[PDB]
Design a protein around this ligand. Structure first.
Ligand SMILES: NC(=O)c1ccc[n+]([C@@H]2O[C@H](COP(=O)([O-])OP(=O)(O)OC[C@H]3O[C@@H](n4cnc5c(N)ncnc54)[C@H](O)[C@@H]3O)[C@@H](O)[C@H]2O)c1
Ligand SMILES: NC(=O)c1ccc[n+]([C@@H]2O[C@H](COP(=O)([O-])OP(=O)(O)OC[C@H]3O[C@@H](n4cnc5c(N)ncnc54)[C@H](O)[C@@H]3O)[C@@H](O)[C@H]2O)c1
Ligand code: NA
Ligand code: NA
Ligand code: NA
Ligand code: NA
Lengths: 483, 483, 483, 483
């Protein structure tokens, strides 16, 4: 497999290539061409010029129709996209088929629709002379949108940025994670085949520092940088665009808590925390890595979770009852195992897992680890405060509602929280006091694309979703007419 | 010993003080106590703690009432605030009485009212199990808001940030410009007398770099930094808060154009541009420093403007027919004069002004300059492209509509633009093509506080006003209930 | 006392007066002049004219300021207003003090504030010639608003229509209930002293059919009729305005259910149903005249309610621990007692009440009845289906959730419903299935003036509240500009 | 050809039929089965029942997809729908191809989209106990929607109601005009083939009084009646549904003015008024039957319009350059010619037209009239005040802006107005002062489906379009949770 850049309507190679590796078995999947600074410049310039071409002349309705055409194109090649996400990342085929690909299609359709229905504001005012004035606002394309995405839900998170950028009439230069370049490259093929004018969508491959990613962030030709990834990367990028005062939108790390109250439906909470800790092998930004369970049900909760975690099937993405694939890469597994060791050093009881499974086949050359549960750590332990991004959670008892609220909030992160309780008052009273951008009550990772999405503190800045994306990806202009 | 900080409900001095100078005569007005890093920390911590006191417990209705009381407090001491603004800035008394103070009061009233009327969103969704789920959003206080403000419209711009900050339930640490500290200090006394709880509003005085401004910018305890000032400073601030990923809102420099078409009302356009160029002695972010006039009316427009400029009275804030006061400081005057010289060097024709008036009295010790009109520079001249922020404008002829639109847009700034034309189609067709956040047609500086306000490119990041402020100064949380 | 009409800025008498009876003791409170057709027309013509006077020239900010002055004016004669409502209706003094009057003031203040903050819409569209078009909307005064109101919460319900009517720049012709004309007459005094331009607010006294009410409804000079009263009266008025195609807003009768599930907090539910049943002696449209209680807790619930019910103090508005006053009138008691009998004939067990109290003083000349609880009736019984509007409820057991939902919904009415449960899923699942405009969970008659308020089926049409009022009381116009 | 009813998923005949006539030549097109009261009852009951079946269980997204399939089905049989509208009404083929059928399709697509993107409101409130409460609103299906539509733009106006009705989850019983039943019947075929569940959409054929229309209007099983037609018919229907207090939405007659100011683009205005007067042979509710032209250009405008009118091709729907077809029916022509006579009797000068064209072929048995222009009548003449709904306009001079605004507003109707001017201030100043629901400047009949559409005074009640439809075709319910 060879993955090229896509710049100004053409697929192009580069003077440097890097390997895409399958985490299931450590084998080479494809060669990826790393865009250099010159090619990043070429992509931004094409994007700037495309804003002045046919793309810029399309009516909102025609633009939306084209975007639905893009979505049709992905649907027409549904299984090729499934194969690509799975190859790159080792995610179970079931997850790619039911969540990943359909959601990436839903991203384009939802924002295309929003573009058609969205409107702006009219403000009347009085004036001295008594003839009055009108102020009206309009949404216009912001310009060239730089998109930089992570490896954990490659096409879903890529299209979550690209869909609204295009729906708002911008042009795009997007850099997917070096770990997961395939589905973004296939999407470039879909764009090309759907007749998207050259320069409107540009795909550049590579790394961050001193590579495609950094060059993009440094280019004076962009109008905004939207980013999803680690918090420290977010800070680095915010500094990079500071001189250009570029618009910025960041969804970043988390150290998410799940709270199980005594009045929770216990089997449901056990199933839910099992899903929220170990889905995608713990590699979702929304995963719960800290868990608080009322003292009265703590022991029973921990026993039940141990049992369920130990029935999880870890293996091939298309294996019968598979629950978990491997981690994204050997490098990431090194980091995760290092955290496994640190937890024992910090005094943790290992309730289950804590190592890597032994398959006695090619999977042993992959990047697998065991779902892991810890107990007995203090709230200030590193393993309870730092984002690990693997299939793990620490469980701690609590006694009081105000107590557990303070403990959930005692964090430099603030992305998401999940609360389990059958009590009406408690659900609402407690949810509003959690210092995060997203709370789920009695469920996890249900997403309505209309809702505002983002985090607080180190977990981000700004919101995307529904009208928040329509506002971020547009110039909002106010036009005032004296009458 | 004149102007103190107000930290945790107490006026306090500092280790060192600095002089506040009257730009009308160069005389000492007051000594100002410069907060140190230690006092900056004390202020941020007090603001953090106030979030958890009685302020955090007020209903939105009671909070709004308390804010109207602050407004009533300013009103009760109207002339004292007038005297303070006039002293610091040399502002004509009439304009402080009619524009500055009433508008500072309106800031508090408008956002109090908005806080009471604002609501959020309810999203219903279907789920696999057929029972559904509810997503709803809430606005909560973001936390501690760091406010850094400029000297040009001291109280107006200070309250423009402080009003929505408080209306949204935040606490505040605000640093007014070293050049204009008085009206903000009086506002501290008004907050005190109205019984605003300690820690909710904190005033710190000082400079930027290596002083109170920088320190506020670097404190990990704030949740957001909203700033009005030079673009250079915006960039500097964006880098400072990057490690904390703090929310940012920037309204920065401009090099605003006025455009006068042949079908304009010529007398109204001359009067309009006179105001947009020379109001507040050209020291408003929204002033026009570039003017494009259709060739058919150019000579007449220039001759008319020269006549009206030379009828402007430059003098004392209480001088009978006074139109213009001094620049803010000798330092700013030096910069403006350096541009006056550059302009000549660049080949400009000085239509009028170009120097400093000779008063033969104490005003000669102040910081006055002449309202100035240039002609003959190219679009690439420094004086045509760099923000001067003095009472000046260059006037250039134009021939075509697409031409002038391009010349207006050919700037690294994009704050505002004024268009003069009587033609229905042209007004709306041209206005939408100008790459700014704010367009006025047949007027200038008409402000409705409900409208989105901000700029593009180097002129800013984000929007404030109406719901945009209610959103910026709030944590937006989504809460999803599985049924 | 003497109650005059207020027409074109003048208090005026008429050719006929009628008696205002105090129902505490049957004494004559005042004579009320009955507007005749000539006076009604005179009122409508003045309101029409007033639209082109100073009122119509007021900015929205000035209009809201005056409206707040109306509110200030009520606050300044607060006790006079309490006295008035109490005199007319027998309402407990505490209740008029803390609820009735403050809320009438809140009506003006809230709609004044909404008027200032409300805005409209801008829609951009592409056109064949590639130049496009703009559609914008504006709210304008609808014109002359006819207001006809009931006797149960005189000032509150009066001002609920008058406030938004005036806040939207309309003029008003208002016909208060013949039973409760006092507080409205006082308000006319407040309007006058506040300086409300003559013709802007007109008060007309009289009855419905063949009287002022009817004449108002038949007048071609009004633009809308907003009504609160009996559903049959609503249908009558609907036919009256049909030839003129007038805009209509109806809040009509109900036969509201309270539902108590087994997982309710029983003590709070007992207290809640006590209030929803007997507040204002059961003379609120929102009262629960039907109650369904889970079988498992039915007997305990009835016993608790009986006890709490028998603790209710029925006497003087000023009497010490007073809980109930009399019904509004002897005529109304005749109807209520007639139902008391009907319930017996129908098979009801009288758990408590069912007659009239005995005072051996002037009150025996009043219009008092006993708080009553029935049991043992069929869902098809008249007493359980028809609105009584007295301090009465029937309690029936239920077993299944879908069963009780069906029984609540089995009604030609559909105003409000109260649900008692501590279960999260249940609260939300059941509430959405109740076919009414207003559901309360674990409380009753909590009112936020921003929310949409109204009923379904016979209980009304349209919604008022928040933007629904801003919409109903304005002309919405769409202006389309071809560019 | 035979047109059956569609009831509960079955095409059904009836006891009696009536003839559908081609107005082009007076020939029989089809026999149409007239629904009787018994069949109307079956339809309504099927519709109530369908709300409780599969239709009522669809997610909003699945409902929207099914509605896009309905639209697809119309698209797939596009030319059959064209032929049907033309046969019924004599509409030029070009207009049916470019305007009539594409809009019918757009109606379904737009409201399907609005249904996916629409959301409701969250209101937080404080309470005495300090724990607070939530109010959230939801949109539910109103229930069974009765739709009665007119003959002028049959499928367009029919689907304008049926689309939002279904998009909002209602079931429908629809009665198209007796003059134009074909496309509605084809629409029922598309519904059937698309798999729309039985009872969801029901088509009943017949007349109004003493027929299907009247019976639908009287059935207590409907929840709303939405109507487009004559004002007097609207009044009749309003009385009919009054005992049931049914929600109603009316779009009724007009007597629309066009105004041509001295600064208009004269040739553009002549062409505009030509179109607004004679499109669909003057048979659009939005047509201009009154025209006011500035005195300075009156004679030239009138001479210009005469020439352009006499250039119109009146003939067969597929005739080479055809501009106008016949009126809908001989009955309607009888009324139109009656007004032609009356105009003469009232003292009108006939500038052109005023009779019937003579074809000397089968068209002479049709219902054609000549496009007609009058001059010289008083503002009080009946021909200038009463809706004719033919291809006619009267033209009168004016001098002053306020003068003409008053003359336009001096009507019992208030649907629309077209204004012609090149002046920015005038466009906006004059448009806001016209008492109508819709103004166009320098164009006519430009429709954005997101905009509020409707009239004032006799021209209607309520608004439809965008969120106004989403609100009208839904139950708005407020749910209040005590926390
Ligand atoms: N919605 C959310 O908040 C959300 C969602 C998913 C993942 N995340 C976070 O993403 C992280 C995991 O993804 P990741 O490991 O790929 O993050 P990674 O930050 O370290 O980098 C992600 C992307 O940024 C690029 N990049 C790295 N350094 C750069 C630089 N100096 N300049 C420009 N670009 C640079 C990378 O090439 C890659 O495309 C986790 O921390 C996770 O929590 C957040
Ligand atoms: N939010 C609500 O829906 C709400 C609230 C409170 C009370 N109500 C209803 O109010 C009713 C009690 O008040 P009511 O007894 O005064 O109703 P009442 O209908 O018989 O009359 C109310 C008003 O209508 C006038 N009126 C009567 N006949 C008229 C006619 N033919 N034409 C014009 N006007 C006429 C009356 O004079 C009075 O001003 C109850 O049915 C109750 O349900 C509704
Ligand atoms: Na890979
Ligand atoms: Na100073
Ligand atoms: Na009375
Ligand atoms: Na026909």
């Amino acid at each position: 497999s060879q993955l090229l850049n896509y710049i100004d309507g053409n697929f192009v190679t580069s003077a440097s290539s890097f390997a895409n590796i399958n985490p299931v078995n450590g084998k080479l999947i494809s060669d990826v061409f790393e865009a250099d600074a010159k090619q990043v410049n070429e992509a931004v310039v094409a994007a700037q010029n495309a804003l002045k071409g046919p793309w810029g002349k399309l009516s909102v309705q025609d633009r939306a129709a084209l975007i639905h055409k893009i979505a049709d194109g992905i649907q027409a090649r549904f299984e090729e996209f499934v194969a690509a996400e799975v190859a790159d990342t080792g995610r179970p085929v079931h997850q790619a088929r039911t969540l990943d690909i359909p959601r990436a299609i839903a991203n384009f359709r939802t924002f295309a629709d929003l573009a058609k229905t969205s409107h702006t504001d009219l403000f009347e005012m009085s004036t001295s002379d008594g003839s009055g004035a009108l102020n009206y606002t309009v949404r216009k394309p912001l310009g060239v949108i730089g998109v930089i995405s992570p490896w954990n839900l490659p096409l879903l998170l890529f299209t979550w940025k690209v869909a609204p950028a295009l729906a708002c009439g911008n042009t795009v230069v997007a850099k997917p994670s070096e770990e997961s370049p395939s589905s973004a490259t296939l999407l470039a093929e879909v764009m090309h085949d759907a007749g998207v004018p050259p320069g409107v969508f540009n795909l550049i491959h590579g790394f961050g520092k001193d590579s495609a990613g950094e060059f993009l962030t440094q280019h004076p030709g962009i109008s905004a940088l939207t980013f999803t990834g680690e918090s420290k990367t977010g800070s680095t990028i915010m500094k990079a665009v500071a001189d250009g005062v570029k618009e910025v939108s960041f969804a970043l790390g988390g150290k998410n808590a799940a709270v199980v109250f005594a009045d929770a439906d216990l089997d449901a909470a056990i199933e839910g925390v099992l899903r929220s800790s170990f889905t995608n092998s713990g590699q979702v930004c929304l995963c719960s890595e800290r868990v608080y369970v009322h003292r009265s049900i703590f022991d029973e909760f921990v026993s039940g979770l141990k049992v369920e975690a130990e029935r999880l099937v870890v293996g091939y993405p298309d294996q019968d009852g598979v629950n978990m694939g491997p981690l994204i890469s050997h490098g990431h597994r090194d980091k995760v195992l290092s955290y496994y060791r640190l937890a024992v050093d910090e005094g943790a009881t290992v309730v289950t897992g804590g190592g890597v499974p032994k398959f006695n086949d090619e999977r042993d050359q992959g990047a697998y680890v065991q779902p892991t549960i810890w107990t007995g750590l203090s709230d200030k332990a590193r393993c309870v405060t730092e984002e690990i991004f693997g299939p793990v959670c620490h469980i701690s008892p609590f006694d009081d509602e105000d107590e557990v609220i303070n403990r959930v909030n005692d964090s430099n992160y603030g992305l998401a929280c999940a609360i389990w309780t059958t009590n009406l008052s408690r659900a609402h009273r407690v949810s509003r006091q959690i210092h995060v951008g997203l709370v789920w009550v009695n469920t996890w990772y249900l997403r309505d694309l209309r809702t505002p999405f983002g985090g607080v503190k180190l977990s981000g800045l700004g919101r995307e979703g529904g009208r928040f994306s329509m506002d971020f990806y547009s110039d909002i202009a106010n036009i005032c007419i004296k009458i």
